Coordinates of C-alpha atoms and ligand atoms in Angstrom, one line a residue:
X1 CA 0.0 0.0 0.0
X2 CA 1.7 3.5 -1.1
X3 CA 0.3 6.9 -0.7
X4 CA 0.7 9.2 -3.4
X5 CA -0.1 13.1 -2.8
X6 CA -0.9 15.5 -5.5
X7 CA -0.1 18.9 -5.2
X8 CA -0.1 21.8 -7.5
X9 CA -1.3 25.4 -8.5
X10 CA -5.5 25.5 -9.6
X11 CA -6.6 24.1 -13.3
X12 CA -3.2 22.5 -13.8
X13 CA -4.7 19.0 -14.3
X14 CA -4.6 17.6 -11.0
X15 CA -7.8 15.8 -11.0
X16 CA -8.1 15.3 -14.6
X17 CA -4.6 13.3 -14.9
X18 CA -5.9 11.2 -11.4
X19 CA -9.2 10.3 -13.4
X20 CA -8.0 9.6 -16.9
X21 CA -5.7 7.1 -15.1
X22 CA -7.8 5.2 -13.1
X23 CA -11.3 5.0 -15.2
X24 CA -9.5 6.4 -18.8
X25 CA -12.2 9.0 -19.2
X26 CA -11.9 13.0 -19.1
X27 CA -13.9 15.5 -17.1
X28 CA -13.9 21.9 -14.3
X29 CA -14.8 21.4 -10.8
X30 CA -12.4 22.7 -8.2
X31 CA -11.5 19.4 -6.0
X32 CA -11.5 20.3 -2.3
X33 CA -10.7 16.7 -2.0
X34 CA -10.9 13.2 -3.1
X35 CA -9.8 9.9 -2.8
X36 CA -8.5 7.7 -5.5
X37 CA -7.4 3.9 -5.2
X38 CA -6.4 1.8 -7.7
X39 CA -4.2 -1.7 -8.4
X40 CA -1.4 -1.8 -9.9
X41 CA 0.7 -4.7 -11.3
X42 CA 4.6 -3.9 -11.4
X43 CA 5.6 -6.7 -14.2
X44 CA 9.2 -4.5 -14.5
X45 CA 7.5 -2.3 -16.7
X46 CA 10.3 -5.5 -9.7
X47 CA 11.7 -7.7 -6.4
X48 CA 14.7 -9.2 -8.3
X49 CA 16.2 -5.2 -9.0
X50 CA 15.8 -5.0 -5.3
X51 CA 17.9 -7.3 -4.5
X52 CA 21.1 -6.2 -3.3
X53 CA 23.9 -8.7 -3.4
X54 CA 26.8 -9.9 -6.0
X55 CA 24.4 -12.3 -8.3
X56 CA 24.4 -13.1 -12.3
X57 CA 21.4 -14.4 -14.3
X58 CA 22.9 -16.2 -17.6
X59 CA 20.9 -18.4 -20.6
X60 CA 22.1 -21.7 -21.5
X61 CA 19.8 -22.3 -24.3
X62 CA 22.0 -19.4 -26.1
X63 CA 25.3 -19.5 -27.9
X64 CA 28.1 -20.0 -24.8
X65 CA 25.7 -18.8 -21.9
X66 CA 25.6 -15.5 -21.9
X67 CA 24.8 -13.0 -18.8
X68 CA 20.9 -11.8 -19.5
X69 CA 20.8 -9.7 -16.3
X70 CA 23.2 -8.2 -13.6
X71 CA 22.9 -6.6 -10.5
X72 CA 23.7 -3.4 -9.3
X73 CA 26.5 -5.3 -6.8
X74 CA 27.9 -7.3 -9.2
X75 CA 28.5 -4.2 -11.4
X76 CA 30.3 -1.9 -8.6
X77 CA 32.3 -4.9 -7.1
X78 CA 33.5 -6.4 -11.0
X79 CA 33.8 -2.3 -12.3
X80 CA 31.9 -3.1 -15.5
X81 CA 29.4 -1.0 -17.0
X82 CA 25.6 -3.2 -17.7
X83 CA 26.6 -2.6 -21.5
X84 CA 29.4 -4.2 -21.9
X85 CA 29.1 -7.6 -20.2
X86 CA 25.0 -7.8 -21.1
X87 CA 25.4 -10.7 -23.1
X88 CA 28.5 -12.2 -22.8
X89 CA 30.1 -15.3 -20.9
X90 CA 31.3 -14.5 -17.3
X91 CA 34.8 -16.3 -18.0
X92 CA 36.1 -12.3 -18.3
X93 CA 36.7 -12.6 -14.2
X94 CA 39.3 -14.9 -14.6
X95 CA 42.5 -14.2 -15.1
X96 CA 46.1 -15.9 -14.8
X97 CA 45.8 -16.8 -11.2
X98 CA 42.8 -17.9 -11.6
X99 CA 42.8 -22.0 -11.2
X100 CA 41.9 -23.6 -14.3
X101 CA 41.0 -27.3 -12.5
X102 CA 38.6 -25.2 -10.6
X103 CA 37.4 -23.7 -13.6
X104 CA 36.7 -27.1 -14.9
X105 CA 34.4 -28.1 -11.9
X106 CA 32.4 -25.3 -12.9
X107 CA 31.9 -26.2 -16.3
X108 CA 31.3 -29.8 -15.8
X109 CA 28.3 -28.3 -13.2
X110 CA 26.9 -26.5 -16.5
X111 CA 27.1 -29.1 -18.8
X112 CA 25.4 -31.5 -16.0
X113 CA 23.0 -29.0 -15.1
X114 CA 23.8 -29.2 -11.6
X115 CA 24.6 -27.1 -8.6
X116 CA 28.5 -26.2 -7.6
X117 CA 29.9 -24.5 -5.1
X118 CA 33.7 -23.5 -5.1
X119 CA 36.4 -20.7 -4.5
X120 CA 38.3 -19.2 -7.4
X121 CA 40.2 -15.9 -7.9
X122 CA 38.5 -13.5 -10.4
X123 CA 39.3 -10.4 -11.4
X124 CA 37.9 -6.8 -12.0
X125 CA 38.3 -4.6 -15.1
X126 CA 40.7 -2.7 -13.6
X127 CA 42.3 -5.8 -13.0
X128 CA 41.6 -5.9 -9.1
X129 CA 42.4 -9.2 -8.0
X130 CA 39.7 -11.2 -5.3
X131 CA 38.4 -14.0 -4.1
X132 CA 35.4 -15.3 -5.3
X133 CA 33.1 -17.5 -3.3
X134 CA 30.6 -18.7 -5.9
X135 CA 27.6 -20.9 -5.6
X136 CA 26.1 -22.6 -9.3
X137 CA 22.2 -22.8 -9.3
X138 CA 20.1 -23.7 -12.5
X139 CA 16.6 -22.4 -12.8
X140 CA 14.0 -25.3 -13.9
X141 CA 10.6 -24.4 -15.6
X142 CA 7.4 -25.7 -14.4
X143 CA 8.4 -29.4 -17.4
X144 CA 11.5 -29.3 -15.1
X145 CA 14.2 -28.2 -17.7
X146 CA 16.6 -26.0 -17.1
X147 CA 15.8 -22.7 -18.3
X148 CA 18.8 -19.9 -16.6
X149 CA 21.6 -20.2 -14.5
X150 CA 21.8 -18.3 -11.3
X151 CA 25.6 -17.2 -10.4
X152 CA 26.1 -15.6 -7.1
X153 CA 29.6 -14.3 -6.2
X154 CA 30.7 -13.9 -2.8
X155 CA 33.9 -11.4 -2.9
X156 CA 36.7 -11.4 -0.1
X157 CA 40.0 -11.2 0.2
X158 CA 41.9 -14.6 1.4
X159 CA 40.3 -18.1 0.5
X160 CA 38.1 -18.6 3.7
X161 CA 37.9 -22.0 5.3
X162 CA 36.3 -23.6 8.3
X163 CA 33.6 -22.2 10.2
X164 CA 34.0 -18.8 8.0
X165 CA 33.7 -21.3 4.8
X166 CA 30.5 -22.7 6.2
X167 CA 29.1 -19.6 6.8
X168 CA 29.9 -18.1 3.5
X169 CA 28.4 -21.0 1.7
X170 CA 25.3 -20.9 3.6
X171 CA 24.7 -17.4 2.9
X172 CA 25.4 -17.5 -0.7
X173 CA 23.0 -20.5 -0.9
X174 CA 19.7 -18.8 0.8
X175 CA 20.7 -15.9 -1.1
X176 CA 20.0 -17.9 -4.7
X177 CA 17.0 -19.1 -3.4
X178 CA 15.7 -15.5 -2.5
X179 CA 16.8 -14.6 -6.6
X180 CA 15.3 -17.6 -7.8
X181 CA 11.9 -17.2 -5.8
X182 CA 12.2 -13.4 -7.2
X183 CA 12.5 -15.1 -11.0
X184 CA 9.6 -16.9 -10.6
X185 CA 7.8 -14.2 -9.4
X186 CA 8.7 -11.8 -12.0
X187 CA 7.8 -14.0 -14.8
X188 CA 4.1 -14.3 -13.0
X189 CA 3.7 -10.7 -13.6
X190 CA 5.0 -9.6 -9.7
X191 CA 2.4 -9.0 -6.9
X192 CA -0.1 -6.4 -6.9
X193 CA 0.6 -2.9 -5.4
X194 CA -2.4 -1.2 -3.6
X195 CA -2.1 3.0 -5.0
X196 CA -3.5 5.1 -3.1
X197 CA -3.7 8.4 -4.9
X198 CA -4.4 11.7 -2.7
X199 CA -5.8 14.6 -4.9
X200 CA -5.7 18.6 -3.7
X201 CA -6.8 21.6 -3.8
X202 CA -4.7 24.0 -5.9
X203 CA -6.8 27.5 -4.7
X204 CA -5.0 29.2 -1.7
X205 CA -8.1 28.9 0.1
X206 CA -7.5 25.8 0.9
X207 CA -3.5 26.0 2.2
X208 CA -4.7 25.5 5.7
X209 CA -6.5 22.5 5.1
X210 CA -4.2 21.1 2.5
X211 CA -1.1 19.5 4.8
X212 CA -3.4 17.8 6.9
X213 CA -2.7 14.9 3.9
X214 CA 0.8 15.0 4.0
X215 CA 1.5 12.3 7.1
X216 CA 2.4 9.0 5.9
X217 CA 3.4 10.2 2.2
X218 CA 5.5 7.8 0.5
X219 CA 6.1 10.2 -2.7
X220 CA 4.6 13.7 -3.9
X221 CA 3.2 14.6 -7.5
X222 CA 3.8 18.2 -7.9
X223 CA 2.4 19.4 -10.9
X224 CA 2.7 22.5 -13.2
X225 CA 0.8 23.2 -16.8
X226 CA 3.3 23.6 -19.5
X227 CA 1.2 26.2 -21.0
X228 CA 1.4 28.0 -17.7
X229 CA 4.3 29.8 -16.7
X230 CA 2.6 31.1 -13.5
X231 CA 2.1 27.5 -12.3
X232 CA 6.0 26.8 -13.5
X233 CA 7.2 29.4 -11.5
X234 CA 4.9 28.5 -8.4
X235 CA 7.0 25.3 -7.6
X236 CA 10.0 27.2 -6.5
X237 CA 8.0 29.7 -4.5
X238 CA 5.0 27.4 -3.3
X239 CA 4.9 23.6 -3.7
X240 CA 8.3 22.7 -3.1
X241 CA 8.7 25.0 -0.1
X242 CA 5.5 23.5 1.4
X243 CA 6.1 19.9 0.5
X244 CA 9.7 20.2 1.9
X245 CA 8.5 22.3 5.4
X246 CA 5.9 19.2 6.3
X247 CA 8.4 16.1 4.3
X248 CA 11.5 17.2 4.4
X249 CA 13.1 13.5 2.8
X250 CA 10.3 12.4 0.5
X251 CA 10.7 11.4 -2.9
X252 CA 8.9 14.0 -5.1
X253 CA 8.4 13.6 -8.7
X254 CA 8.2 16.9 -10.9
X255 CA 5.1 16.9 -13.4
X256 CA 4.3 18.7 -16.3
X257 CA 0.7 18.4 -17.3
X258 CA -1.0 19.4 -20.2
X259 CA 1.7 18.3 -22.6
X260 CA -0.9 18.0 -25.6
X261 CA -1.1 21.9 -25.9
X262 CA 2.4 22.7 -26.1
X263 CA 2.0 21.9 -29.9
X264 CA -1.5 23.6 -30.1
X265 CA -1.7 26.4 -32.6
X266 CA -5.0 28.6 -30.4
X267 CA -3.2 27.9 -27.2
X268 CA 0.0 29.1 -28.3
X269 CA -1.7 32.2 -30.1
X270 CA -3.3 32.8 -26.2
X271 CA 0.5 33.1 -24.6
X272 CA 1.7 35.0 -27.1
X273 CA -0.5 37.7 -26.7
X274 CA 0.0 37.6 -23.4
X275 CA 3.7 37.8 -23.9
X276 CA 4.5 34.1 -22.6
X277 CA 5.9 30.8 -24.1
X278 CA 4.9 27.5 -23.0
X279 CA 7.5 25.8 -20.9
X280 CA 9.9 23.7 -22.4
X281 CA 11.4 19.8 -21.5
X282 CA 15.3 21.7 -20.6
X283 CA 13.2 24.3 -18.3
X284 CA 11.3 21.6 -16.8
X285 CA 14.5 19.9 -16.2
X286 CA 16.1 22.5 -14.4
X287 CA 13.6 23.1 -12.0
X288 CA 13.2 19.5 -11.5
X289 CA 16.8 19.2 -10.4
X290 CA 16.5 22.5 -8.6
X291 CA 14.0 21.2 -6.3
X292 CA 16.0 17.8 -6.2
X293 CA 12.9 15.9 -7.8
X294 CA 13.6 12.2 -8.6
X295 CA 12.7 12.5 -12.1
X296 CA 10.8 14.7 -13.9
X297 CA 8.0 14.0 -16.1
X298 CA 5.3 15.3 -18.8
X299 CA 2.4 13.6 -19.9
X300 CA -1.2 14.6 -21.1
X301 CA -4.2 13.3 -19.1
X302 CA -6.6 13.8 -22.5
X303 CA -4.4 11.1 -25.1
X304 CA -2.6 9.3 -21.9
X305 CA 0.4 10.3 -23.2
X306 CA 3.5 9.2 -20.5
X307 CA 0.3 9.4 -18.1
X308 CA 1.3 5.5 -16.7
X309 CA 5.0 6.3 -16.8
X310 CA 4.3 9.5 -14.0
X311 CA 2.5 6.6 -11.4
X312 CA 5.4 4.1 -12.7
X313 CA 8.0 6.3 -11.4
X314 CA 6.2 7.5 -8.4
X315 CA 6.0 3.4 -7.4
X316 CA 9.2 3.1 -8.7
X317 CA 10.8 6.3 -6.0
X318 CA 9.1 4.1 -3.4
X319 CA 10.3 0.9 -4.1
X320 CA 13.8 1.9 -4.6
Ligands
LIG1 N1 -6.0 19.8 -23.4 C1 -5.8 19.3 -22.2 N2 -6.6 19.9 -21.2 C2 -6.5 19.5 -19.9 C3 -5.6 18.4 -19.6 N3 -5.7 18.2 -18.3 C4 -6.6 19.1 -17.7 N4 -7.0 19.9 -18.7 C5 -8.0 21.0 -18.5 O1 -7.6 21.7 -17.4 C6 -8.6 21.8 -16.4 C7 -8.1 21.5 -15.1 O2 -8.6 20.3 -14.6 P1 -8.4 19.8 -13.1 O3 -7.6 18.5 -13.1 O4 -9.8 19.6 -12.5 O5 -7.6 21.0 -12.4 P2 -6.8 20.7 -11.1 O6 -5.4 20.5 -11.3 O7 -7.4 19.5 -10.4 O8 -7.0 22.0 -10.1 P3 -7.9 22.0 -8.8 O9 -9.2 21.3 -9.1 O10 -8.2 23.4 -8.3 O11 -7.2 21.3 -7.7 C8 -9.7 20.8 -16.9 O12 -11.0 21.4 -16.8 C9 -9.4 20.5 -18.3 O13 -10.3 21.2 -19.2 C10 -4.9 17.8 -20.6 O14 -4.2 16.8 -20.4 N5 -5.0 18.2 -21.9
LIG2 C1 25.2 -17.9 -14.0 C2 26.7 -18.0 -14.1 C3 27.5 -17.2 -13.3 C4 28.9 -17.3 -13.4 N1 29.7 -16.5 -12.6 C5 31.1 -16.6 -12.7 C6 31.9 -15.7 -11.9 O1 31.4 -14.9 -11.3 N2 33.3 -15.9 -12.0 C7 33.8 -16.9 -12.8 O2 35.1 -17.0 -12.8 N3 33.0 -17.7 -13.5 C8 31.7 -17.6 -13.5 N4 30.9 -18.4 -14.2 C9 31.5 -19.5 -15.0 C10 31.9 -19.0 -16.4 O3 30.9 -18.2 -17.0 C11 32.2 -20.1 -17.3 O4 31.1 -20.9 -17.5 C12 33.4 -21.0 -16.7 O5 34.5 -20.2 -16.6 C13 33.7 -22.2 -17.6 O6 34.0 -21.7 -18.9 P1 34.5 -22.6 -20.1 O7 33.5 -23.7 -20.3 O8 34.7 -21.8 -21.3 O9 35.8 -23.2 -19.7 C14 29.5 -18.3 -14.2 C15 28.7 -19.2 -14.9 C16 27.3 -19.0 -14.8 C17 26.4 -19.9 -15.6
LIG3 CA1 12.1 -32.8 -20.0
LIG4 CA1 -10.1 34.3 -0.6
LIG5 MG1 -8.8 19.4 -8.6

């Protein structure tokens, strides 16, 4: 269950982009408030990003096993970049110290299809020589052939034995069946993530009833209208002051509404003789990383355009 706030100046699209997201249909009526829940399935589009620890995903039914997927640990402790081992054989962590009959165990566990656990030095790209407690772990279907490999890497510094062996072993082991539960899971399409959305009123009425909805927020909307450079500018001198004096450390996630009538010849022709522009992606970046926002986003709550990406991101702030 996540909480999602949105806040933002009057008429900005507020309600609109709440509604067109959760029954696809398009109202004005000035929202004192409402409440808004609605399930959402995150299918990566997950618990397997969120796992923290040295691990490898590879494909056996491809050309010499390439790595399919890499986490975030493996990448800081090996110094590689996702792009350039995405798709190729782990054997680039060896190196000339690296024992070749232990090597050998590994690939007879591959061909076999079974589990092997052993210690080998590998090495970074730097060339940053380790010790690598790794643990072998295919990953059957529901016919019960196998369809991945699951690699977890342990990295230290000596070749650990006894009672630190055991323990290392053990943890690398419940750690594999945590990634492969998480596998299994992902290809089910996840779990199903309870959205609560929170929608506000924008008049200034309503600023002394208006943070009595802020407790237990687990990430804030604050939207502006692109084709309204008074809402732009209220962000820095309203929202983000407000948002930051009642939750000072959560996630907020900048959005630019109304994105349809940026390219609109009659709204265009309104600005202008008004002497305004409608605000641009590069201004709506810079106040987004002005205000320290996550990510910033623009969408259009009348042809849904990036409308799912904005309550993606806002699960996605909360989940990682
Ligand atoms: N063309 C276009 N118009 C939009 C869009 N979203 C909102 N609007 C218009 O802008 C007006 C603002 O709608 P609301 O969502 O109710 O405004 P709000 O942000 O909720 O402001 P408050 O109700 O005061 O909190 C609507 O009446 C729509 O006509 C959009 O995506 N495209
Ligand atoms: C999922 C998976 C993860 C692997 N991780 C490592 C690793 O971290 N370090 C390493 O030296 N070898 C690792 N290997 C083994 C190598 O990728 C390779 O299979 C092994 O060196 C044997 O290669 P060869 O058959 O060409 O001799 C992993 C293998 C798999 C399937
Ligand atoms: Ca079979
Ligand atoms: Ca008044
Ligand atoms: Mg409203």
């Amino acid at each position: 269950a996540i909480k999602c706030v949105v806040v933002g100046d009057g008429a900005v699209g507020k309600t609109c982009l709440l509604i067109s997201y959760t029954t696809n249909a398009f109202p004005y009526i000035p929202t004192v408030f409402d409440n808004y829940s609605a399930n959402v399935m995150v299918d990566g589009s997950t618990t397997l990003e969120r796992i923290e620890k040295n691990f490898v995903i590879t494909d056996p039914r491809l050309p010499d096993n390439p790595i399919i997927f890499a986490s975030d640990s493996f990448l800081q402790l090996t110094e590689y970049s996702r792009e350039e081992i995405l798709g190729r054989n782990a054997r680039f962590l060896q190196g000339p110290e690296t024992d070749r009959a232990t090597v050998r165990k590994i690939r007879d566990a591959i061909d076999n299809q079974t589990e092997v656990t052993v210690q080998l030095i590998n090495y970074t790209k730097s060339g940053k020589k380790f010790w690598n407690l790794f643990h072998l772990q295919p990953m059957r279907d529901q016919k019960g052939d196998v369809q991945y490999f699951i690699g977890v890497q342990l990295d230290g510094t000596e070749h650990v034995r006894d009672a630190a062996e055991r323990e290392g072993v053990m943890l690398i082991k419940k750690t594999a069946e945590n990634i492969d539960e998480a596998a299994k899971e992902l290809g089910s399409g996840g779990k199903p993530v309870n959205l609560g959305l929170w929608d506000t009123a924008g008049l200034e009425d309503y600023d002394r009833l208006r943070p009595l909805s802020y407790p237990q927020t687990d990430v804030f909307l604050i939207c502006f209208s692109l084709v309204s450079p008074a809402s732009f500018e209220n962000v820095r001198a309203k929202w983000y002051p407000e948002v930051r004096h009642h939750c000072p450390n959560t996630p907020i996630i900048l959005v630019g509404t109304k994105l349809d009538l940026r390219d609109d010849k009659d709204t265009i022709e309104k600005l202008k003789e008004k002497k305004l522009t409608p605000i641009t992606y590069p201004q709506g970046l810079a106040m987004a990383k002005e205000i320290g926002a996550v990510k910033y986003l623009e969408c259009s709550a009348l042809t849904q355009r990036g409308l799912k990406t904005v309550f993606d991101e806002a699960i996605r702030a909360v989940l990682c």
